[PDB]
Amino acid sequence: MKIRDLLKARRGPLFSFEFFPPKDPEGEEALFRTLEELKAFRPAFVSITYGTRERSVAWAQRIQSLGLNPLAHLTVAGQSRKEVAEVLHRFVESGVENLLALRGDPFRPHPEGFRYAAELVALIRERYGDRVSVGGAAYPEGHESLEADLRHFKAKVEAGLDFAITQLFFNNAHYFGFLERARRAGIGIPILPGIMPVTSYRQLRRFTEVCGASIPGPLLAKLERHQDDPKAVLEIGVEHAVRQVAELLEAGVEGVHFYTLNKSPATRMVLERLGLRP
Amino acid sequence: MKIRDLLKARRGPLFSFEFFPPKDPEGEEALFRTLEELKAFRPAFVSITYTRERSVAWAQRIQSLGLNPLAHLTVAGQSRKEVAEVLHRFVESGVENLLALRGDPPRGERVFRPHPEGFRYAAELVALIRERYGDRVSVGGAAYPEGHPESESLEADLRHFKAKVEAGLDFAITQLFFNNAHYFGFLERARRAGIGIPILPGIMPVTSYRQLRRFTEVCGASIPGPLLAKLERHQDDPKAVLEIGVEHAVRQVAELLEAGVEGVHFYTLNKSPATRMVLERLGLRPA
Numbered sequence: 311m312k313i314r315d316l317l318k319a320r321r322g323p324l325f326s327f328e329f330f331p332p333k334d335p336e337g338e339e340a341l342f343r344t345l346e347e348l349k350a351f352r353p354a355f356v357s358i359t360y361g362t363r364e365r366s367v368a369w370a371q372r373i374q375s376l377g378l379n380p381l382a383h384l385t386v387a388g389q390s391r392k393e394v395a396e397v398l399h400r401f402v403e404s405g406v407e408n409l410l411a412l413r414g415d416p417f418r419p420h421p422e423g424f425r426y427a428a429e430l431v432a433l434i435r436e437r438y439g440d441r442v443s444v445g446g447a448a449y450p451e452g453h454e455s456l457e458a459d460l461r462h463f464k465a466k467v468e469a470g471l472d473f474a475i476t477q478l479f480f481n482n483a484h485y486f487g488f489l490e491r492a493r494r495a496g497i498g499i500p501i502l503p504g505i506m507p508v509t510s511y512r513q514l515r516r517f518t519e520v521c522g523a524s525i526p527g528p529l530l531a532k533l534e535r536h537q538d539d540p541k542a543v544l545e546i547g548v549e550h551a552v553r554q555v556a557e558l559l560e561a562g563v564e565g566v567h568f569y570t571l572n573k574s575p576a577t578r579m580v581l582e583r584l585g586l587r588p
Numbered sequence: 589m590k591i592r593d594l595l596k597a598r599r600g601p602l603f604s605f606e607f608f609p610p611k612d613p614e615g616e617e618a619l620f621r622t623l624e625e626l627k628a629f630r631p632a633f634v635s636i637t638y639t640r641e642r643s644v645a646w647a648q649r650i651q652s653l654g655l656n657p658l659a660h661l662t663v664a665g666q667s668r669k670e671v672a673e674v675l676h677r678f679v680e681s682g683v684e685n686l687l688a689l690r691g692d693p694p695r696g697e698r699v700f701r702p703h704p705e706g707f708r709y710a711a712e713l714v715a716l717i718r719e720r721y722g723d724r725v726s727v728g729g730a731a732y733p734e735g736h737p738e739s740e741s742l743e744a745d746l747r748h749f750k751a752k753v754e755a756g757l758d759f760a761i762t763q764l765f766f767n768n769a770h771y772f773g774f775l776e777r778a779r780r781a782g783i784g785i786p787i788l789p790g791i792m793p794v795t796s797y798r799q800l801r802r803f804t805e806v807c808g809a810s811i812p813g814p815l816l817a818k819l820e821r822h823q824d825d826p827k828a829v830l831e832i833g834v835e836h837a838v839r840q841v842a843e844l845l846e847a848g849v850e851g852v853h854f855y856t857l858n859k860s861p862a863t864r865m866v867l868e869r870l871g872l873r874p875a
């Protein structure tokens with residue numbers, strides 16, 4: 311089912327899961343076993359982050375074969391326009407109905423490639439129109455100004471987005487604040503909050519330096535005073551994500567997208583502790 | 589200054605204050621001393637809740653202090669012609685900012701019935717103002733994040749809100765709320781309905797247990813379980829009820845400001861130090 315339609319269907323909040331490319335063959339089999347277990351939570355869609363162009367088409371097929379609904383990540387970084395159109399064709403031919411159009415981390419484009427995620431959105435709409443559902447990344451904490459960032463989002467939405475999924479955040483006020491900039495800019499599409507519980511102290515450099523997320527003071531303090539206790543970090547991260555999602559659901563979000571480490575049960579723990587395992 | 593122009597300028601959050609009709613002449617002079625002391629804070633605008641001749645004079649006196657008045661104007665218990673006459677009295681006073689309200693039933697009555705030659709909906713007053721004054725005035729209306737108590741559902745309430753905006757609102761101020769998620773959820777419903785106008789959160793710190801009945805039944809605000817717990821085990825200690833209410837409002841407003849609201853609108857009892865205490869602890873006024 312197209313995510314556009316799943317969102318209109320209004321049958322409670324949608325819970326989605328994003329996993330990561332497996333490290334080795336046994337990790338890939340453990341990832342698809344974990345996907346089979348995940349049917350317990352009735353996930354509205356599942357994805358594996360895209361670098362592995364041929365692997366990702368086969369993963370989309372494997373997810374389908376499990377009776378799950380794949381969201382295929384497609385990036386424009388380090389590919390020609392022809393290369394990106396080819397992977398696009400391969401996904402939709404395989405029965406993929408849902409695409410997440412991303413620029414990719416490094417920015418300097420491939421010399422015969424696209425520069426902006428909006429160009430990939432426009433390509434999909436040119437080739438497939440409304441036969442597919444297309445999402446893009448939203449950045450509640452931005453990167454230039456938040457105002458310039460929001461104009462770049464508006465542009466991408468207007469290229470033909472059906473929905474957006476946020477970058478991970480730990481401070482819900484930043485997500486609500488992005489939704490308010492979007493409303494003032496006339497953006498009405500569904501914007502799903504993305505949540506990654508802190509599972510280890512090592513992650514905080516990635517989160518701040520790479521993903522640009524901010525760590526609220528009360529969370530940062532608890533983490534850095536327990537920084538050498540892996541069990542403590544995990545409990546701090548799950549508790550923080552439980553409180554975040556509890557407030558997001560009270561604020562009528564249409565769903566929550568969970569960034570899940572392949573081996574980590576944290577996202578499953580968050581939904582169990584909220585009483586949301588069916 | 590028209591509030592739609594203050595909001596467009598985008599210079600950080602607007603802070604506004606709404607006070608209550610004074611009870612006697614000493615109270616009236618003490619209220620206007622308070623407003624003279626507030627001008628140091630550069631409030632975006634100030635109002636007294638809506639005696640129709642008195643309300644026009646109060647708007648004049650606020651202007652006399654160099655403050656920007658928001659004239660509250662209701663349709664309850666007045667003919668269309670009486671509402672039009674009061675409206676004209678505000679505009680001719682140089683009042684540029686109107687808040688078009690239906691108004692409550694009279695004191696001790698709980699069922700709204702329109703005056704037989706009167707308006708029924710605030711949207712009718714918004715349309716009157718736009719037909720008669722156009723862009724000479726900036727017009728706001730009430731929004732209800734938890735729904736009007738007399739609305740049948742949140743989706744019907746939102747439909748009615750949209751109709752009021754389409755009548756010619758430049759902005760809205762919410763009913764008071766205690767649970768920020770209900771405010772954020774209202775903005776998300778407004779966003780899904782294509783409502784883009786600025787919507788300013790209305791905050792009233794709990795200053796007494798007795799107020800909770802007004803808040804839940806007349807105003808239609810829910811009280812979160814933790815706060816309700818704490819209030820209903822401190823009922824007869826007004827020093828601590830004050831402290832509970834101020835600390836809850838500080839935590840609300842802190843989150844609203846981190847969520848980049850376009851401003852905060854504080855409902856302030858005339859003698860109450862609660863708003864001042866909230867501003868001090870937020871670092872917006874000196875201790």
Ligand SMILES: Cc1cc2nc3c(=O)[nH]c(=O)nc-3n(C[C@H](O)[C@H](O)[C@H](O)COP(=O)(O)OP(=O)(O)OC[C@H]3O[C@@H](n4cnc5c(N)ncnc54)[C@H](O)[C@@H]3O)c2cc1C
Binds near residue numbers: 660744
């Ligand atoms: C910031 C603020 C300031 C206030 N100031 C004052 C004040 O100074 N004096 C005072 O007495 N009160 C004041 N109030 C209270 C307000 O007047 C009451 O809440 C009143 O009950 C409703 O006012 P309103 O303008 O929202 O009404 P309206 O917008 O007319 O709504 C009244 C009801 O009618 C419904 N409705 C609206 N349009 C339609 C339609 N076309 N068909 C059917 N149903 C419809 C609504 O959903 C709602 O249930 C204030 C409230 C706020 C939030």
